[PDB]
Structure 1
Amino acid sequence: TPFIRPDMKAFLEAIAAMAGPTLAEMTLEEARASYVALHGMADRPARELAVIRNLSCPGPAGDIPLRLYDARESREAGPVITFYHGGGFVIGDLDTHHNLCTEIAALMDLPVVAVDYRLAPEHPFPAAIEDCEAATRWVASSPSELGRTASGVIPIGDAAGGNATIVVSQLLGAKPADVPVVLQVPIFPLASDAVGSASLEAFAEGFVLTKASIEFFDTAYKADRADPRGFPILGDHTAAPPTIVATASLDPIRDSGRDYAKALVEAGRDVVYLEMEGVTHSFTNIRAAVPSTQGDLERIIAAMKMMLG
């Protein structure tokens, strides 16, 4: 009987009523479409912004599509947020997380560049990481196509995107971009392997992200358990940038985020650890279906402003 907010519980009851196929039982196109449909009906609508612009940058496999969000048509040099969507490195795209990106841009009053990285199974590990790193370095170089100079970058992302956040920050720590990572915001990230964790057993079914979906994602992505680009808990934390780790109390991978924040404290790094009570994985993208999660996102925003000083 873990604590669940009433609005969260109602959403979980509707998902249970829907029932229907697992990700693995669908075709890939169907699986991706169902995620579009879920966030389409569950999230608050897009904020209006001065700038919402599609562009691209070079990557190791070809061009990487990007989307720029900015509440300001013109702005001075400052930190730029570099966002990586979740979806197990298999599903999700620029549209599944579009509304959340507009919200981050609106509430932070900073530019946001979302990365349309290559997906598994067609592009297995480390394709997503390669693209997220390359796009983040490109933004950090203040290209003229972007139209706003970066004094630093802020990697942020949910779930798989929170995994990518941590990996990108480690890769740029080892080999700096043109400006530093000034803050990283992994939201319900995968840092340590969730297999064997207490949270995975406790929340394996009925809490939006399922153990079955995790296994489907594992099989598609094929990240080696010994590779720190797959499981960044294995990385060097001694120079980790300022960090905000946000988890959900009902998340099967909650303990992975607990592990990562503990590792940062162990290494003497500054970290804000926020564990949202009574909500699930995906809370950043279900802000209309579960209205209390808007407040959870706003707490992350407040922590970001504080850590940026």
Structure 2
Amino acid sequence: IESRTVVPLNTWVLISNFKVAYNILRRPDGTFNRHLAEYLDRKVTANANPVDGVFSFDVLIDRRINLLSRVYRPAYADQEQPPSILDLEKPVDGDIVPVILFFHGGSFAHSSANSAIYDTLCRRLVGLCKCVVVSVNYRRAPENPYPCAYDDGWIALNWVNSRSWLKSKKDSKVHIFLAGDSSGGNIAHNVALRAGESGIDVLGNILLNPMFGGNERTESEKSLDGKYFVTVRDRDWYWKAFLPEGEDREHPACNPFSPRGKSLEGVSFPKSLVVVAGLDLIRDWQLAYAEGLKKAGQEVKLMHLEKATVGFYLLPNNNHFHNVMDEISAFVNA
């Protein structure tokens, strides 16, 4: 009854359907109904014909692990006929062209890079930020637990960096931005942390409601317990299915600012943009992450939305959508 007064009707319908389905696909033992999940998932296909100024195609970047990636680019201004394959990897033009490397969410279990929700999010990002977007299809859990996802992200980052038609005609270098939502925020944080010591330079991070957590219960969890399409019993299921057996929630993959982690002070970390939803369950953990980034000395901009829930960025029928998109566009093209 309370959830119906803070979100529009159709977003409520979508999120409630997702929650009910994921309720019926979850089993107390620890197993997951993978076949039924793939049946219930809605997907789309690549289309090299430009629709609303965007066309896309798939690239198989690794065959030993079946690593896929979907590439989105704007329509060509000097080409009447539809693009083909020779022109797919056509060298980009312009002084500076941003490249966004995107990781989808789903608590390391749900969805896929080819899902319609993320194909639409990536198309909107291309349309508004006016840049190139590369979506990554990383391994899911519990079939493939920690750290399959960080390895997939690292390989995709290397492939994006090594391309030659993605470069710029101003400094002969690629402008790489890491982005993600939910579990994508975790993947982006760890990929940047492992990219700071390899040499590859990352321009920034865009975290859309990152999924972090710890061991002690916060006031947000006690008060918002299962009242805004997010319960505490299913958070523990997802954390148990991803982390290795015999490890609590103080593992560094769960709590970056844990005693068992390495300090971020004096470490090469890029500029960041953290977006926090006020009405979501795990709100204090995100604010604690932003506070720790600020205290460590790293640059960070915090965007706290006092009346936003999870999945506020899947439909354009609200006011948080435009604000977040404008902030992202100003963040990238600065």
Matched-pair contact (CA < 8 Å) for 1:55–1:65: yes
- Structure 1 range deviating more: 84-93 or 96-105: 96-105
Change (3 A) 1:205 1:229: closer
Match of 1:152 among 138, 160, 175: 175
1:260 corresponds in structure 2 to 289
1:302 corresponds in structure 2 to 326
Matched-pair contact (CA < 8 Å) for 1:192–1:260: no
Secondary structure of the 2:313 match is helix
Matched-pair contact (CA < 8 Å) for 1:12–1:208: no
Q: CA deviation at 1:13?
A: 7.3
Q: CA deviation at 1:80?
A: 0.9
What does the per-residue CA deviation read over 1:249-305, in whole Å, with 9 as the maximum and x for residues that have no partner?
1111222211111011101222111122322122222x15xx21xx32332332233
Matched-pair contact (CA < 8 Å) for 1:153–1:181: yes
What does the per-residue CA deviation read over 1:77-125, in whole Å, with 9 as the maximum and x for residues that have no partner?
5331000000011111011411111111111111010100011111101
Match of 1:66 among 69, 72, 81: 69
Q: Would you say 1:78 and 2:97 are equivalent positions?
A: yes
1:27 corresponds in structure 2 to 33
Q: CA deviation at 1:131?
A: 0.4
Matched-pair contact (CA < 8 Å) for 1:205–1:211: yes
Secondary structure of the 2:176 match is strand
Q: Distance in 2 between matches of 1:209 and 1:66?
A: 30
2:110 corresponds in structure 1 to 91
Secondary structure of the 1:283 match is coil
2:308 corresponds in structure 1 to 279
Q: CA deviation at 1:33?
A: 5.2
Q: TM-score, normalised by structure 2?
A: 0.76
Change (3 A) 1:231 1:92: farther
Q: CA deviation at 1:16?
A: 5.9
Q: Which of the pair is proportionally richer in helix?
A: 1
What does the per-residue CA deviation read over 1:217-268, in whole Å, with 9 as the maximum and x for residues that have no partner?
2222125545434433345433321110001111112222111110111012
Matched-pair contact (CA < 8 Å) for 1:264–1:270: yes
Change (3 A) 1:306 1:10: closer
Matched-pair contact (CA < 8 Å) for 1:194–1:255: no
- Report the residue type matching 1:92 in the other structure: S
- Report the residue type matching 1:53 in the other structure: F
What does the per-residue CA deviation read over 1:35-77, in whole Å, with 9 as the maximum and x for residues that have no partner?
x45x99xxxxx97343311112238x52410011122444345
Change (3 A) 1:137 1:254: farther
Q: CA deviation at 1:190?
A: 2.1
Matched-pair contact (CA < 8 Å) for 1:47–1:99: no
Matched-pair contact (CA < 8 Å) for 1:163–1:232: no
Change (3 A) 1:198 1:134: farther
2:151 corresponds in structure 1 to 130
| Long gaps (5+) in structure 2 | 45-49, 77-91, 168-172
Structural RMSD (CA) = 3.1
Larger Rg: 2
* Structure with higher RCO (Cα < 8 A, 6+ apart): 1
Secondary structure of the 1:240 match is coil
Change (3 A) 1:185 1:20: closer
Question: Which structure 2 residues correspond to residues 1-309 of structure 1 after superposition, within 5 A?
Answer: 6-8=6-8, 11-12=11-12, 20=20, 22=23, 23-25=25-27, 27-31=33-37, 34=40, 36=41, 48-58=52-62, 62-73=65-76, 74-76=92-94, 78-94=97-113, 95=115, 96-141=117-162, 143-144=163-164, 147-149=165-167, 151-177=174-200, 180-193=201-214, 196-223=217-244, 224=247, 225-233=249-257, 234-238=261-265, 239-285=268-314, 287=315, 291-292=317-318, 295-308=319-332, 309=334
Matched-pair contact (CA < 8 Å) for 2:16–2:229: no
| Long gaps (5+) in structure 1 | 41-45
Change (3 A) 1:88 1:3: closer
Q: TM-score, normalised by structure 1?
A: 0.81
Q: Distance in 1 between matches of 2:215 and 2:75?
A: 40
Q: Distance in 1 between matches of 2:215 and 2:321?
A: 24
